[PDB]
Each structure stands twice: as structure tokens, then as C-alpha cells.
Design a protein around this ligand. Structure first.
Ligand code: COA
Ligand code: COA
Ligand code: COA
Ligand code: COA
Ligand code: COA
Ligand code: COA
Ligand code: COA
Ligand code: COA
Ligand code: COA
Ligand code: COA
Ligand code: COA
Ligand code: COA
Ligand code: K
Ligand code: K
Ligand code: K
Lengths: 489, 489, 489
């Protein structure tokens, strides 16, 4: 968007002052939408010397004569030209500016407008900026942040030593990565994205996206009336072990609940019988194993089972030992079908295999699994969308990096999912999503499309749970999938 | 509270007469709140010679001129000074006092105010006091008890030969143990605790507590949005046998339904497969046993399974034989994790093991199990909160002594739970609570906090069952846990 | 009530401290009833050195530990014993007292409790008490007055140089005259009268009363089913002139709307025809006059018309000239029926006539008319209930002194009416009330009873008007009378 503002001024010829005026009035309107009538409130506007501060002076000026009181505290040592222009207007209109933040000043105001730093912040916040931000956060006032809460790195969502906790953030043109990834997402509060007059073509030239309800609705496959089960695809799920007998069942029902026609599971005997006792609509093939885990002796049978399906999911509950590792890698190297690779299949995966496959794959790691896959620390991979993009491009796959905000990428397009809640931070949730992705691929969506629709619907289903989210289990999530689909439509 | 009244008079300087006036007016207001307008009712006030009787004279005097009729029957042979003072006022205001209870007098009155004995009662009630109390209980009149129903031992809740059955009890400052433990709890009817002017500091210096909704709400852990399953803890449940295959499943789901991230069960094969057939989100590890019960040969495996969890629960459905006893005690002596110890693990427990553990423990006996643990009779341990406190202090543990009123103590603080109903008097209920406690410990609550929140939520869930409580089963209780959490919030 | 408190302590033996405690707790409960939960508010308690201040210390002490903050500002130079006692308790309980009112202290509090002066105030408030009261009134805080707003003379309702404007006033035992007469009535805000333990016999020995709905309901006459018009009385109204043709009509309908059986008007021809054109149920007898006003030539006819009625009303719209004066006085001296004397009949009345009548009379002056009748200024008679009582006793009549608060007295019992609104400050309103009084006398109520019921119902009817009260007219008031009667029942 730094690019976007510059082209809009330099190539399109929109005066920088017009963009700044539109930015500020949009904050005023946003506030009115959340607070109702503004005339009873007293506003403290905290302005930096940059263009975020300039936007703050526009806000402040537009409140003059209309609200109970407005004061600007200017916290800068110099002003960008647009900030200087809007400072001068604020003062010409009769506005009061002070240059020293006295901690008790907070007592006399209802709303704090945070226009200290925007996307221009670089480096840790120190000194008196930090003391001020901390005082605002302890004040209990309503906080409205201009563009991004001050102290959030707009490219990453990390806190730069400290940051404002906003009730309402008003950003311009498009959301920033820092609104979408945590901790930034938490500090943003309610986000409104304001149209401030950039050409719609430039706004739409962005290559990273938030997954929206309208996007998912347009990707949901068609259900032709004259269909039969094969119309809706066939999935094989290779999953489970004597240790982990539940995973197959959750993956399988995840495929069925999204509309897949036929789902079969290959599960070590007698753990395969667990699935049909719970959901007799599943096909749960018994696999004769030596000690309760898949091994190379099961390679040929699993390849034969794969011949008559559209997609294969592998990994949930397989276990991780050397014999599973041999099986997984040899299977994936030979399988000429799309694969969804999760859990223990990721843990044992040789990435060389991904490079040599002709068929597509989707990988669904959490950050612990991603860290192991690229031999890095969890902190180095968590919310690292550039790493994810590089990995997907280098390995010719779709990568679905699960977290509260889920990143989906094929290395060219990257999508961020914000549906869900903490009830999904519980064993079994990932197994459901794996089945969902395979099911949608089986119905004819591309690996990327299937991943996009699935992460959104999985999170939206969680949110439809009727009692406290901490009590949500994967079994209940399964029941909520068709409701999420209905509500989406 | 004997202490509380004395310090309030002697150190704070509040006249004893002021406290007694406040006590009596609080009974009047309480009655109005339950009966509506008092002017249509005829009141029979039964006064002893102590301060409870004095409170009764205040009630009676305050009804004069405002209700249809008031009569006091004075049943004492002498009067405390405050009782004498309020007797004289009652008579000066025109009140009628008789000194002989004629059984037919009950016919002419609507409400009986029981001010015979309060917390001053010592020893069995005999003679004419007993005949009177029995006549009141056969009368079918509305009964309001001042402080405690006469005949209840306020320290224990036991009936002292006979006691008044009250519709409404109005007590002063704080509830008494006798309101909270049975049979006293039953005889109290609806309880109101009136503020009669003790300093809030003295009221708050009490070391025993009733577990309230506000206490539990403040202890419920946080659900940070940017979480993953490990944020919410990991539990291992060592449970079950060839005899008792259901217990593990109920304990495990009890952990999951309270928001725990990961739950694994160690259960003798093939009984472990029962769990995942019902709830495939559980991990149910098969343990190779000789004859269907844990023994020392499973010690090393269970220790290895414990390395990657936060808390271990042990006991439900283990069975009780010598080989289980060897396993339990050796496991607990070696385990360096918090333990929740229930059921058959309590039955075989060597308490020496508790003393030598560095890690904490919570024990969850019913009175039969407690009796066996301390080698006493059920009657000697039931509702024996002092024994429970001594046991917890001596063994460095939290003790959760289950009954209709549940006692939770670490030997310094003692909490009483009054949520629940008789649907919990059924097999499986305790197994659920064990999982709940372990789950909350795994989420970061202290053993005492986890026990407090769990007993309350377990009982409150029971009360949310929509049909007759006698039909409640543990499976339905599990379903109701997240609703109890929602309602609590 | 000074008497009442003293007898309750000295004869009945209630400790003065008990009465003061009950007074203060009643203010707390009253506040809770109006503000809801008190725990979120910060209270500033302003205490004088008298017993009102003592009551304030009780309030303050009872808020300690339960609300957000409590501060007492003590504004006195010495303390009554009970005030000293409750000051010491407040401090022992940890309460903060300051002895200097800093104007900015108001900023830190939500509720001001006014316990500066009660019924003990004598003389104009000067100096720093006045500055404080004025600051409280400019503060916009919620104000609760203990007993009476400080600065109101509790015997008269006059402001003693300045006074507190309360949102809520809590008084003890009975309302004071100062709550009922203006300006005091305005400054009182919402009034609650608290029972603080005086014997009901002493509370009921008061000889002045507020007219209540229950009193009026018990006085409303019976409507036996087997009745006929004569059962419900007959009224003659002597009223009107060529100047004032509407008055008769309003008086007449006032009698009919309260249930009178027969109403006839004697009105100068042709103004008599106005009445039946509007309400043909009236009998409107034409009286042949010389120049449009009653005179002595009409004396005999009016006496004949009076023979067959129960009550005669005279005065509305008669005009005031010498010939009307001759007629009125000679008529009233000869008439041996109860008379209701209003308006121009009062203006020309010789009070010697009242003394010599054997039959009763009710007089209904406004303060201008009363002033003329006793040859005093309006300021000397307005709300002067002692003058009214003396006048009624000396002249053997009921006096109904109309104003926003209406005084009704026969010289032994005095009643205050507080129903009504400013829509009654408009021509025609008084003419309606005159008809109402005559009607009720005709139905068998005593002059005093009829006056009591009428003033209440007249005011209550005004309040039932559905649109803005300033638009109420006498015609609409007439329509609302039967609704007031229904609502009363
Ligand atoms: C203009 C833009 C290209 C980036 O620069 P900018 O907007 O001026 O940047 P900000 O207002 O966020 O902040 C810049 C100021 O932050 C402060 N700053 C940055 N890092 C800091 C640090 N860690 N410690 C202290 N101060 C720091 C400085 O005051 C800095 O200027 P300075 O370093 O010369 O002192 C653009 O991305 C932008 O923020 N505008 C958004 C669009 C908009 O607001 N709409 C229209 C108006 S142009
Ligand atoms: O040999 P062990 O007695 O340890 O156990 C038997 C099998 O269970 C496997 N195993 C035991 N626990 C396991 C676990 N936690 N995950 C995966 N495999 C496991 C072992 O790898 C072994 O199989 P393998 O030799 O074919 O690799
Ligand atoms: C399943 C089992 C292996 C536990 O593993 P797990 O918790 O699922 O471990 P994972 O590979 O899935 O990785 C979890 C890690 O990924 C990372 N992680 C996952 N999601 C994350 C996110 N959103 N953000 C940050 N970190 C995240 C964290 O580091 C997490 O560690 P933590 O749980 O300690 O916080 C184990 O309980 C079991 O089922 N079997 C026990 C068998 C055994 O090993 N011993 C006995 C022999 S039979
Ligand atoms: O601990 P946790 O709850 O398992 O996970 P957290 O999100 O708090 O942080 C884990 C790591 O992810 C990193 N992470 C968190 N948010 C991030 C963001 N938006 N961008 C890049 N990395 C991020 C942290 O730097 C941390 O790194 P470290 O522990 O190696 O220093
Ligand atoms: C005062 C207090 C310290 C304890 O003593 P108390 O209140 O006078 O005691 P009670 O009114 O319950 O009863 C005392 C009387 O009970 C009766 N009594 C006790 N046991 C009895 C027995 N089993 N058989 C017959 N009578 C018995 C007696 O009449 C006894 O006095 P007595 O033994 O000398 O004859 C205090 O705990 C209390 O009960 N007051 C509660 C607080 C209160 O009421 N608010 C303010 C007023 S002080
Ligand atoms: O010898 P039995 O034929 O009685 O039964 C076989 C096993 O079942 C156990 N057993 C039988 N019923 C049992 C029960 N009700 N609870 C616990 N153990 C039981 C026995 O203890 C025995 O095991 P052990 O010798 O290792 O202690
Ligand atoms: C489970 C089994 C052992 C029955 O035991 P149980 O009822 O659960 O016995 P517990 O140890 O739990 O103790 C129950 C006692 O505790 C006490 N108790 C529990 N809660 C109490 C409370 N709230 N208040 C008072 N007493 C209480 C009572 O004494 C109760 O006895 P009661 O049921 O007779 O009234 C048995 O049915 C079984 O499952 N297996 C049978 C195996 C066998 O022994 N024989 C065949 C060989 S295979
Ligand atoms: O019979 P039950 O229903 O199993 O249990 P109950 O509550 O009726 O009583 C069982 C025992 O607990 C005791 N108990 C019950 N209420 C008690 C109380 N509030 N305080 C102390 N002990 C109590 C009884 O004294 C009884 O003792 P005993 O039978 O040895 O004489
Ligand atoms: C006690 C009672 C007989 C009258 O006296 P009182 O209550 O102490 O009087 P108040 O509190 O209203 O005020 C007395 C004080 O007002 C102040 N005062 C009166 N007129 C004043 C004036 N115009 N200028 C300054 N101060 C004045 C004084 O401080 C005076 O005492 P002081 O003249 O010796 O300095 C009684 O009518 C009363 O007010 N109590 C009501 C009942 C009650 O409160 N319930 C129970 C408690 S007793
Ligand atoms: O002589 P005028 O021309 O003034 O008017 C004729 C009559 O109207 C009367 N009159 C005029 N205006 C009047 C008024 N405002 N109120 C009462 N009488 C009035 C006069 O008194 C006179 O009657 P009177 O002589 O019998 O008293
Ligand atoms: C009716 C007419 C005489 C006006 O008189 P009125 O306002 O009704 O005068 P009243 O006798 O009723 O007395 C009103 C006074 O009583 C007092 N008053 C009434 N109620 C009061 C109360 N509640 N509190 C205080 N004062 C009150 C006031 O002093 C009031 O005076 P104000 O209206 O100036 O404030 C006149 O308009 C008229 O109808 N005819 C005009 C004839 C004339 O005189 N001249 C032409 C010759 S034909
Ligand atoms: O002017 P108004 O609105 O016609 O009537 P008000 O009520 O304001 O006052 C009129 C007179 O009545 C008096 N009055 C008002 N309220 C009073 C009260 N409650 N007690 C005694 N007299 C009162 C005033 O002292 C005033 O007297 P003044 O003007 O001769 O000095
Ligand atoms: K900002
Ligand atoms: K009692
Ligand atoms: K006052």
C-alpha cells in the first residue's frame, strides 16, 4: 500500500492532501458508526509527525465545533508536509495542540484517537513514546487507532516493544498483514477498511487475500440434480494405528460432511472396526499389519485401493517410526493421484518426494510440524508467510500452515483465514480439516481452492457451536459443518 | 461469628442493641420479599431466652400495628440482657406475650417465626421444647427461622434430637456450617444471609467459604486467541480394566469438555477401543496386560506416557487386587507430575506415598473411600470437614470429599460446594469429575483452584438437565458441561 | 415529629442510637431502590454536627467496603451525642473524614448525600454552608437528601436563603410540611417516607394528613343498585352573568360527572341557553335580570329553586358589583341548605354571614380570593395553613385554599392535596371543582369529606390527560373525571 498511495498520487494525479482528508473523515464516520452520536464525547488525539499523525490532525479538525471537547497532543519533532498542512488547518480552525503528554490528561477525555505511528514504524518503540502507549493501555478509555495500532509492525503483526490495544482500528484501502496475524490481530480490535479513493484496479492488484464469505460462496461446487455418488468424488484415507484409532473416523466424516460421494479408510485391523461402529456410512478397510502400524508390506494393497479414487489423504494417527516413514515415502513417490499430507505423514516425509511427484499435493502442518519439516524452530516458522510461499513454490505444493490465523499458499497466491475460535485448539480438529480438503478436491476443486474453502468452513463451523467454545470437540464440529455450508449459501 | 459479634461490639464499639435491631428488621424484610405484603398475615413468634429470642422480640415488635395479628410465646426461664431489653420494648409497644404453648394456638396463625434457639444451642433438645418443635413441624404453617432452624447444630448441621423444618431461614453476617451440611441444609429451606452491620473486614476474615458463581467465574482460565492445543494442557488418564471398561471414556471426556487441549488414556487392551468408538477425539493407548488389569509390568510404559503430559489422573475402573495396588503405589511414588487420585487408586493407596511425593495431588474420595483410607467408619468421616482438613495438611494434598455438599480443602482453606442434584448419585458421575479436575490443572489452575471450579461446574451441569434429574446419566452430564461454562460466564 | 422521636425514646424506651441506625440504613436501602446496585458508585457524604449529620455518618459507615468510594466532609463545629457516636463508628470502621470542602472534590464522586441540616435548621443559611450548597446544586451529581433537603424550613417549605435541590429525599416516620408545600416540594424530588421504628400509634396521632388514594377510595360513596336519581342528590348552581356565560356549564357538569343525580343551574337569561346547547342533560333555568347580573330582585326565585335540592353552589361567573354583593349575602343568610361558595361569591362575601348561618359551607378560594377575604396580602395567605385553620374554626366552615398543593381544613383536621399539574392553572378549572364538591355533598359526604375527595379526583383527572398538560382545558378535564374515578377504585 505504500506503493498504492504513491501510484495514486504520482500516476493517477490525486493530490496527497485529498487522500489524507479522505483518510481522516473515514475515521470520524467509523467512530460514529460504533459510538453513535459523537457530540457527547471528549476526544484526545495523539499525533505523530508522520502521515499517520497528519490523518490524526484531519480527524481532530473535523471534530471541532461538533463534539464536547478535542485536544491534540503532538508527539513528534518534525512533520511531513501533509502533516504540517493539516496541523496548520487544525490550528486555523481554532484547535488546541499541546506538546507534552501529562498522564492525568487522560482523566478529562472519553476517547483516545491513536495517530502516533502507522505503517511507517520501524524498530522498537522506546522512551517517552513507550511510556505514553503504556499509559493509554492502562487508562480504560475507548481507543481508536488510525491505520494500525501504534507499535504493531504492519508487515508481520509483531509488537515493536509495546503497542496500543485498540477497540476500533480504521485502515485505508486494504487490511495490512499486521491486522491479520497475531499479536497484531488481537491489538486491532474491530477492523474497518475504508475506501479513501485509490483506483479499484490498484486495490485489486494485491496478491495476498483475506478469505471472505463471498469468495468461499463462489468456490463451493455445484450440486447437479441428476447426480450419483461418483459425481461427488471418491476419497481414500490412509490413517490410524493401534495407538491412534480415532483419527481415521474424524478424517473420513470430514470428507462426507462436505458432500463427498464415497469415502473409504484404510486402517490397521481391528482398529478399522471403530469407524463403522460410530458411522456405518464409512467404508473402513481392514489392513493386516505386523504390529499395528502401516509398513512396506502394506504398500501394494494401499496402491490398489488408490486406483479407484480421486484423492488420497494420508497421515492422521499413523504413528511415527521407521517402518511408517518407509511406507509413507514409497507410497507418495508411487501414487499418481492428488494427496493431502497431514500429521505423522508430514513428520516422516522426505521432501525430495514432493519434488519428484507429477501429481499435486496439499500439506497441512501446524507450526511444530512445519518447523520439523524445514529444520527450523517454531518461532522461525510461525506466521512466516514468506517461508510458506518459498516452500510451496520450491516443492510444487499447496501449504496450509495452521494457526489461529491460517495461511494457505501455492507460492503465487497467499490467503489468510480468520474464522475459528479456541475450541479448535484441541486434538481431532486437524484430522477433520484433512478430510474436508480431500473431499473438496475429490469434488473437483483445485488443491488451492479446496484448501481455501475448507479452512474457512472449518473455522466457521467452530463458531456455530451453541455453548462455550472451550467445550467444542471434533465430533461436534462434524455435526456443524453442514450448517456452516447452509449459512454460507 | 460468635467471635465476629464480640469484636464488633467490644473493639469496634457497635452497641449490642443495634446489632439485634438490625438482625430483627432483616428478618421482617426477608419475609416481605418471600411473602409479599405482610399486612394480611397473622404471626406466631416463638422466642427463647437467649439472643435468638431477643431477635424474635425485635421481629415481633416491628410487626405490631402493620400485620393482622402478632403473638409471642416466650419459652425460656431467664433472658439475656438484650433479650430482656427487646421483651420490654415489645410489651411497651402493646405486644401480647404468653408463656404457655397451647397446641391449638397454631390454628389461629399463618406464619410461625422460629426464634427459640440459634447458634447457642448445645446438646439434645428434650421435654417441652421438643414437643413444641414437633407440633410446629406437623402444623403445615409457613415457618421462618431466625439465624438457624432451632435444633440444628450450627457447627455440624446435625439435628440435636429434633429440629424445626423452615421454609425460610434468615442468618446474620455469614452462613453457618449447619446451613451447608446435611441434614441442616435440608431443614434450612431457602437461606438469606443478612448484613447486620459487622465490618466487612471481619466478615472477610473467615477461612471457610461457600463456592459461588462469582468465585468460579474469576478462576476460569483465559482462552488466548493465538493458542494451540498445548496451550490448554495435556492429560494422561490411567484407568479401566476388563471389568470396568467405561470409566476411562467418562474421565477422558470430562477433561476435553472443560477445554483441555490433549487427552490420552492408558487402558488395558482391547478395552481401550471402547473409548475411541464412542469419542474418536480421545487418544486411547492399548496396554498389554496379563489378565486385564494394570500391574507392575506396565509401570515403565505408564511412566513413559507421563513424560509428555502436564497432569496424570489415575484410578477410575482400575480394579482392586494386589497387583493393581503394587502398580498404583510404585507409579505414584515415581511420578513427578501432579496426580488426581480417584476410585480404585484411593482404595489401594499407601498414604506414605503421598508424604514422599514432591509433586502435588488431588484425592477425590466419596465417604466410603475416605473411611477406608483413614481406617474409620463412614459415619465418622461423612461431612467431617476437620478430619478432611487434617488429612490434607498431613499429606500435603487437596482433598475433595464428595457428597451432596462437597468439601474441598488443602488444610488451610476449606470450600463447600452446594451445586448438584440426586442425578449425580449414580455410577459414572465421579469418573467425569476426575477428568474435569485433571483438565483444569493441565490448563494451569492450582490443584485447589481446579478442584473448586470442577465441583461447582459438575454440579451446575447436573442442574441444567432438562428432564427429571433421576434420569441423568454421566454421558448426558458430559454434554451439559459446556452449557454450564457458558452460563457461568 | 420532634415530639415523636422524644416520646419514642423517653416513654417507649427505644435507644436514640437505634433510631439513628434505622434512619441511616433506610437511606441506603432507598438509594439502592433508585440507583440499583450501589457497588459501582462513589459517595460524598456531607455531614452537619446535628442529628441529621449523625444519620449521614450512619449512611457513610454502612457504605464502607461495599461501594467504590465513600468520603465524608464534616461541616460542623460540634456534634450532638448521637452524631459523635456515629462519627466515632465511621472512623473505627476505616472511614475517611475531611473538614474542608474543596470545590473540585465534587469531580471525584457520583452521588452526594446531603446530611447537613434537617428539621433543626433555624434561620437563613449564610457563609460557607451557603457556598457549599450552591456548589452541590451546580455540580450535576445525583443528590440524596437525608430527612429534608438542607435549607428548607420543614414547617413551611420556604427556602432559608438557599437550599439543596435533591433527586431523592428520604424522610423518617411521616412527611414534613416542607416536603408538601412549595418551594420545598420542588426541591425534595422523589420522596420516600421510611419506617424507623416509631410506634404506629404515635405516627397515627398526627392531625394533618396527605390525601392518599386509599383515603379517597374509602370515602367514595356507595352506588346501591336499586337507586334512582334522588338517591344521588340534587344540586342547584347559582352562577353566570352576561359577562361570564361559561362558568355555570363547567360547574354543572362537574356535579354530574361525579355521580350526582340531578343538577339545575340558575343563570341570567339568555346565557342559561348556553348550558343546554352544550350538555342537554343539565337543567338550566332562565332568570330574568335587569342588566345581566343577579340582584335582590332574584332573591325569592333562587330561594324557591333551593327548596328541592340538597346543596347549593354559588359564585362562578356571577360578576362583582354592588347588586351581586347584596344578593349573595342576603341569599346565604337565608339559605338553610349546605352551600359551596366560590369565585365572585367569595369576592363579595360578608363573613358575618358565615357566622350566623346554621347550615354548613365550603369556601373554595385561590390565594388572591383568600387575601381579599381576610384583608391581607397574597404572600401572607399563600400556603398559610395556620391562617386557613383559624379562618375555618372561626367561621364554622370548610376552607379549600387552592394552589399547586391544596389545603383543605375544617379547623380541626387539615389535609394536603398533591395531585394535579399546571394544566389546571387555567380559567375554568376552579368552576369544575366547585361542581364536584357540591355533587359529593349532595351524595351524602360531609363538607370535609366531599372537599377531600374532590380536590384529589380533580387533580388526578388532570394527570390522566393524554397530551401535553399545558393544552388541558376544563372541558377535557370533565371528560377525564369518570376515568379518575375508575382508576381510583
Ligand atoms: C507515508 C507512508 C508511505 C509511510 O510513512 P508515514 O506514513 O509518514 O509513517 P508513520 O506516520 O507511520 O511514522 C513515521 C514516523 O514514525 C516515527 N518513528 C518510526 N520508528 C520509530 C521508532 N521506533 N522510534 C521513534 N519514532 C519512530 C517517526 O516519528 C517517523 O518519522 P521519523 O523517523 O523521521 O521521526 C504510508 O505508508 C503511510 O503510513 N500512510 C498510510 C496511508 C494514509 O495514511 N493515507 C493517506 C495519507 S498519505
Ligand atoms: O519394539 P517395541 O517393544 O518398543 O514395540 C513394538 C513396535 O511398536 C512401535 N512403537 C512403540 N511405540 C510407538 C509409538 N509411540 N509410535 C510409533 N511406534 C511405536 C515400535 O517402533 C515397534 O515397531 P518397529 O520395530 O517395527 O519400529
Ligand atoms: C500425540 C503425542 C505424540 C503428543 O504430541 P503433540 O502435542 O500432538 O506434538 P506435535 O508434533 O503435534 O507438536 C506440538 C508442538 O507444535 C507447536 N505448535 C503447534 N501449534 C502451534 C501454534 N499454533 N503456535 C505455536 N506452536 C504450535 C508447539 O511447539 C507444540 O508444542 P507444545 O504442545 O509443547 O506447546 C503423544 O501424546 C502421544 O499421543 N503418544 C505418546 C507416545 C510416546 O511418545 N511415549 C510412550 C511410548 S508408547
Ligand atoms: O509460545 P507459543 O504460544 O507456543 O507461541 P507464540 O505465538 O507466543 O510464539 C512462539 C514463537 O513464534 C513467533 N511468532 C509469534 N507471532 C509472530 C508473528 N506474527 N510473526 C513472526 N513470528 C511470530 C515468536 O517470535 C516466538 O518466537 P521464539 O519463542 O523462538 O522467540
Ligand atoms: C450470643 C451468641 C454468642 C450465642 O448465645 P445466644 O445467642 O444467646 O444463644 P441462643 O439464643 O441460641 O440460645 C441460648 C439458650 O438456648 C437454650 N439451650 C441451649 N441448649 C439447650 C438444651 N439442649 N435444652 C434446653 N435449652 C437449651 C437455653 O435457653 C440457652 O440459654 P440457657 O442454657 O442459659 O437456658 C451468638 O452466637 C448468637 O446466637 N447470636 C447470633 C447473632 C445475632 O443473633 N445477632 C445480633 C444479636 S447479639
Ligand atoms: O485368579 P482368578 O481365577 O480368581 O481370576 C484371575 C485374575 O482376576 C482377578 N480378579 C477377579 N475378580 C476381580 C475383581 N472383582 N476385581 C479385581 N480383580 C479381580 C484376580 O485377582 C486374578 O488376578 P491376580 O492373581 O493377578 O490378582
Ligand atoms: C463396583 C462394585 C465393587 C460395587 O461397589 P460400590 O457400590 O461402588 O462400593 P464403594 O467402594 O464405591 O462404596 C460404597 C459405600 O460408600 C459409602 N458412601 C458413598 N457415598 C456416600 C455418601 N455420600 N454418604 C454416605 N455414604 C456414602 C456407603 O457406605 C456406600 O455403601 P452402600 O452403597 O452400601 O450404601 C461392584 O458392583 C462391581 O462393579 N464388581 C463386582 C465384583 C465382585 O466383587 N464380585 C464378583 C467377582 S468378579
Ligand atoms: O445412611 P446414609 O444415607 O448412607 O448416610 P447418612 O448421612 O444418613 O449417615 C451416615 C453416618 O454419617 C453421619 N453424618 C451425617 N450427617 C453428618 C453431619 N452433618 N456431620 C457429621 N456426621 C454426619 C451420621 O452420624 C451417620 O453415622 P452412623 O451411621 O455411624 O451413626
Ligand atoms: C433532633 C431533632 C429534635 C432536631 O435537632 P437536630 O436533628 O440535631 O437538627 P439538625 O441536624 O437539622 O441541625 C442542627 C444544626 O443545624 C445547624 N444550624 C441551624 N441553623 C443554622 C443556621 N441558619 N446557620 C448555620 N447553622 C445552623 C447547626 O449546626 C445546628 O446546631 P448548632 O446550631 O448548635 O450549631 C430532630 O427533629 C431531628 O432533626 N432528627 C430527625 C429524626 C432523625 O434524624 N432520626 C433519628 C435520629 S435522632
Ligand atoms: O352602568 P354601566 O353603563 O357601567 O353598566 C351597566 C351595569 O353593568 C355593570 N357592570 C359593568 N361592567 C361590569 C363588570 N365588569 N363586572 C360586574 N358588573 C359590571 C354595572 O355595575 C352596571 O350595573 P349596576 O348599576 O346595577 O351595578
Ligand atoms: C376575570 C377578570 C376579572 C380577571 O381576573 P383574575 O385573573 O381571574 O383575578 P382573580 O381575582 O381571580 O385574582 C388573581 C390573583 O390571585 C392571586 N393568585 C391566584 N392563585 C394564586 C396562587 N396559586 N399563588 C399565588 N397567587 C395566586 C394572584 O395575585 C393573581 O394575580 P395575577 O393573575 O396578576 O398573578 C377579567 O379578565 C374579566 O374577565 N373581566 C374584565 C372586566 C373589567 O374589569 N373591565 C372592563 C369592564 S366590562
Ligand atoms: O409570585 P407568585 O408566583 O404569584 O407566588 P409565589 O409563590 O412566588 O410567592 C408569592 C408570595 O407567597 C409567599 N409564599 C410562597 N411559598 C410560601 C410558603 N411555602 N409558605 C408561606 N408563604 C409562601 C411568598 O413569601 C410570597 O410573598 P411576597 O411576594 O409578599 O413576599
Ligand atoms: K496509529
Ligand atoms: K431459631
Ligand atoms: K439534609
Amino acid at each position: 500500500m505504500k506503493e498504492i498511495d504513491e501510484l495514486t498520487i504520482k500516476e493517477y494525479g490525486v493530490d496527497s492532501r485529498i487522500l489524507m482528508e479522505r483518510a481522516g473523515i473515514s475515521v470520524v464516520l467509523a467512530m460514529e458508526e460504533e459510538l453513535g452520536n459523537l457530540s457527547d464525547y471528549r476526544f484526545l488525539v495523539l499525533c505523530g509527525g508522520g502521515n499517520n499523525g497528519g490523518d490524526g490532525f484531519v480527524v481532530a479538525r473535523n471534530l471541532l465545533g461538533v463534539v464536547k471537547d478535542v485536544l491534540v497532543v503532538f508527539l513528534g519533532k518534525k512533520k511531513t508536509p501533509d502533516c504540517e498542512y493539516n496541523y496548520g488547518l487544525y490550528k486555523k480552525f481554532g484547535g488546541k495542540v499541546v506538546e507534552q503528554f501529562e498522564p492525568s490528561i487522560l482523566n478529562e477525555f472519553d476517547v483516545v484517537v491513536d495517530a502516533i505511528f502507522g505503517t511507517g514504524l520501524r524498530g522498537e518503540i522506546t522512551g517517552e513514546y513507550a511510556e505514553i502507549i503504556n499509559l493509554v493501555n492502562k487508562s480504560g478509555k475507548v481507543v481508536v487507532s488510525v491505520d494500525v495500532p501504534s507499535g504493531i509492525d504492519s508487515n508481520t503483526g509483531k509488537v515493536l516493544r509495546t503497542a496500543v490495544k485498540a477497540d476500533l482500528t480504521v485502515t485505508f484501502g486494504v487490511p495490512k498483514i499486521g491486522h491479520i496475524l497475531f499479536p497484531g490481530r488481537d491489538l486491532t480490535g474491530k477492523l474497518k477498511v475504508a475506501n479513501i479513493g485509490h483506483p479499484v484496479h490498484l486495490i485489486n492488484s494485491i496478491n495476498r487475500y483475506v478469505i471472505t464469505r463471498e469468495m468461499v460462496r463462489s468456490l463451493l461446487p455445484e450440486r447437479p440434480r441428476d447426480s450419483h455418488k461418483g459425481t461427488y468424488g471418491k476419497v481414500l484415507i490412509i490413517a490410524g494405528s493401534r495407538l491412534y484409532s480415532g483419527a481415521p473416523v474424524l478424517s473420513g466424516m470430514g470428507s462426507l460432511k462436505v458432500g463427498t460421494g464415497l469415502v473409504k479408510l484404510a486402517v490397521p485391523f481391528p482398529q478399522n472396526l471403530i469407524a463403522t461402529s460410530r458411522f456405518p456410512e464409512l467404508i473402513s478397510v481392514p489392513i493386516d499389519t505386523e504390529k499395528g502400524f502401516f509398513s512396506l508390506q502394506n504398500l501394494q494393497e494401499c496402491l490398489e485401493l488408490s486406483k479407484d479414487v480421486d484423492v488420497v489423504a494420508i497421515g492422521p494417527g499413523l504413528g511415527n517410526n521407521e517402518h511408517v516413514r518407509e511406507f509413507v515415502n514409497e507410497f507418495l513417490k508411487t501414487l499418481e493421484k492428488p494427496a493431502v499430507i497431514d500429521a505423522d505423514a508430514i513428520n516422516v516425509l522426505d521432501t525430495s518426494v514432493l519434488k519428484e511427484r507429477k501429481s499435486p499435493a496439499v500439506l497441512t502442518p501446524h507450526p511444530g510440524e512445519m518447523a520439523r519439516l524445514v529444520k527450523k524452530t517454531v518461532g522461525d516458522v510461525k506466521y512466516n508467510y514468506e517461508l510458506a510461499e518459498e516452500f510451496a513454490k520450491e516443492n510444487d505444493c499447496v501449504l496450509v500452515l495452521k494457526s489461529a490465523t491460517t495461511i494457505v499458499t501455492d507460492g503465487e497466491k497467499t490467503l489468510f483465514n480468520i474464522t475459528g475460535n479456541t475450541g479448535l485448539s484441541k486434538g481431532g480438529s486437524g484430522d477433520v480439516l484433512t478430510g474436508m480438503i480431500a473431499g473438496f478436491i475429490a469434488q473437483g476443486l483445485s488443491p488451492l481452492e479446496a484448501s481455501t474453502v475448507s479452512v474457512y468452513l472449518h473455522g466457521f463451523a467452530a463458531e456455530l457451536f451453541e455453548q462455550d467454545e472451550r467445550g467444542l470437540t471434533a465430533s461436534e464440529l462434524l455435526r456443524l459443518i453442514p450448517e456452516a455450508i447452509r449459512r454460507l449459501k
